[PDB]
Write a protein that binds this DNA or RNA. Structure first.
Ligand SMILES: Nc1nc2c(ncn2[C@H]2C[C@H](O)[C@@H](COP(=O)(O)OP(=O)(O)OP(=O)(O)O)O2)c(=O)[nH]1
Ligand SMILES: [Mg+2]
Ligand SMILES: [Mg+2]
Length: 539
DNA sequence: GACCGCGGCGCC
DNA sequence: AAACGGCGCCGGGTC
């Protein structure tokens, strides 16, 4: 492969090496390109970046993110990963893709640029006459790679000094719980060690072991088990509280302050485009799609995510999203009618569950209600439901009968999808995104029924993922015309940063864009809110 | 020091 | 734990 001097011509494929996996933190150790049987190895990578019209290759977005960090508007174009991920969503890493489709993922920039060339050719051949996947690539994923590059580069502002103060109060409160716990135990032990805790609960005290752990068969100390033991002993309550506080302290309060980038003074997630089986995104390195909200301390954490001074945050969340999508995919007249009447299923279940007026339903209850409703739908057992509702197997049985009885045509939709998946080996979204579910023909029932549950979930969760992705592609250009930013996506939610002056305008627009993104047999309602912080914005 | 599998748990 | 699904990150060992 011919070594040509550096500058590549128009349309050349890129290859690059990083010091570490995160583009906002990485040093650019090497940069190369390749077109028409040639390799160009940049002598100084950072300068060499100025020459490029676009990032075109494996992980184009990562290089575009790093380019944006350096003031360069190098947008991402073609990426063989995005092609492979639509061909098969188990195609998730370049190591795997390379091997599957005719190369080897190396550590040298040149070799990676040549890999990008030959992998694109092969994969692009695999997609000719795959009309719906080509549609998805050009009209959703490829433009989206650019939108995410801008989100990553921008980041979100975080109240550092606030969280540092919060850390010290939690540490005091944690210390009280461990000191209580040890006193009831009658001796000190590492309370973060679940093995030690097992012995204390089940051997040293006479507590009944509810469940075992999957891989190694140890007696489980899961919150579920511990809730079932709330009355057995006082120490349980303390353990549950200790578990909440240390989880949040070790995962959010302490790491996040130390992850502020020095140039930006902001927090930059990575939005992994080829990471899930359904077509959802994932967020990592810091994961900002799992920031706390539920518990009071979780909320105090969430409010640490704030706007730039002079700006406001704008949070938009699709209402009852996967239920609405389901009603379209199934055509359940009875279920459509619920959304045509503007009724909230999460509130109805909540009001019913706790036995209260709908106006009394709080967020805590509503969250519990979602578990009930999605759980049933996707195949939760009567056994579990009973404990989730905390009511008899007699009565919890009757719920899966009545819930399903209201809305037929779904089960008809479930059966159909599974039969199609048996026949063709995959299932698909409304836009023809595929997931191969080969264990539908599995001879072992537990493995078969697991596969089935994954199978009929995907079209629903994945269609919703496609809608949110599409809405993002359409919305992003309109935001930059308004001098507003797109900050985060949390599956069916978007978080925007708009200047106070234009904040309400952005909110109105972005709602209409999201609701009208692709009309269906049901109206896609969106809840929007505005605030100085993330918590206030959703309230 | 890097990485591993596990149990556990935050969010959607 | 439990026959909901989809994620990524945290705190007893190997090498
Ligand atoms: N299978 C399953 N899916 C969930 C669960 N929680 C959330 N999801 C999926 C389905 C939801 O529609 C979607 C978005 O989560 P949200 O918190 O926005 O819930 P949803 O939109 O249904 O209700 P909302 O009206 O927005 O509060 O993610 C769950 O516990 N199980
Ligand atoms: Mg929602
Ligand atoms: Mg949501």
């Amino acid at each position: 492969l011919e070594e040509a001097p550096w500058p590549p011509p128009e349309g050349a494929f890129v290859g690059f090496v990083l010091s570490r996996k995160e583009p906002m933190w990485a040093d650019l150790l090497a940069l190369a390109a390749a077109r028409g049987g040639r390799v160009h190895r940049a002598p100084e990578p950072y300068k060499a970046l100025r020459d490029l019209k676009e990032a075109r290759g494996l992980l184009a977005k990562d290089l575009s993110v790093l380019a944006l960090r350096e003031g360069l508007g190098l947008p991402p174009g073609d990426d063989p990963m995005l092609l492979a991920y639509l061909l098969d969503p188990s195609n998730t890493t370049p190591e795997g893709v390379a091997r599957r489709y005719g190369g080897e993922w190396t550590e040298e920039a040149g070799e990676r640029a040549a890999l990008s060339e030959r992998l694109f050719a092969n994969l692009w051949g695999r997609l000719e006459g795959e009309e719906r996947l080509l549609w998805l690539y050009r009209e959703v994923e490829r433009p989206l790679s650019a939108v995410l590059a801008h989100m990553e580069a921008t980041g979100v502002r975080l109240d550092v000094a606030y969280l540092r103060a919060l850390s010290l109060e939690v540490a005091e409160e944690i210390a009280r719980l461990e000191a209580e716990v040890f006193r009831l135990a009658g001796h000190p032990f590492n309370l973060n060690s679940r093995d030690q805790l097992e012995r204390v609960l089940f051997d040293e005290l006479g507590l009944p072991a509810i469940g075992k752990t999957e891989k190694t068969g140890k007696r489980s100390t899961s919150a579920a088990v511990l809730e079932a033991l709330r009355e057995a002993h006082p120490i349980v309550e303390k353990i549950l509280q200790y578990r909440e506080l240390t989880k949040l302290k070790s995962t959010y309060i302490d790491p996040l302050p130390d992850l502020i980038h020095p140039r930006t003074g902001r927090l930059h997630t990575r939005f992994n485009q080829t990471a899930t089986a359904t077509g959802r995104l994932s967020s990592s390195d810091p994961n900002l799609q799992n920031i706390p909200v539920r518990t009071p301390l979780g909320q105090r954490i969430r409010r640490a995510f704030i706007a730039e001074e002079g700006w406001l945050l704008v949070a938009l969340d699709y209402s009852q999203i996967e239920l609405r999508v389901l009603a379209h995919l199934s055509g359940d007249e009875n279920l459509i009618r619920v959304f045509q009447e503007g009724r909230d299923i999460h509130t109805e279940t909540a009001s019913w569950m706790f036995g209260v007026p709908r106006e009394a339903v709080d967020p805590l209850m509503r969250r519990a209600a979602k578990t009930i409703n999605f759980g049933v739908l996707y195949g939760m057992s009567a056994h579990r439901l009973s404990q989730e509702l905390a009511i008899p197997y007699e009565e919890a049985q009757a719920f899966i009968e009545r819930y399903f009885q209201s809305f037929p045509k779904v089960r008809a939709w479930i059966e159909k999808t599974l039969e199609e998946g048996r026949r063709r080996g995959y299932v698909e979204t409304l836009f023809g995104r595929r997931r191969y579910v080969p264990d539908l023909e599995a001879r072992v029932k537990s493995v078969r029924e697991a596969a089935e549950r994954m199978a009929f979930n995907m079209p629903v969760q994945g269609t919703a993922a496609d809608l949110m992705k599409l809405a993002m592609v359409k919305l992003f250009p309109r935001l930059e015309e308004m001098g507003a930013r797109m900050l985060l996506q949390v599956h069916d939610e978007l978080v925007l940063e708009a200047p106070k002056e234009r904040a309400e305008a952005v909110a109105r627009l972005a709602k209409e864009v999201m609701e009208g993104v692709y009309p269906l047999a049901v109206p896609l309602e969106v809840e929007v809110g505005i605030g100085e912080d993330w918590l206030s914005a959703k309230e």
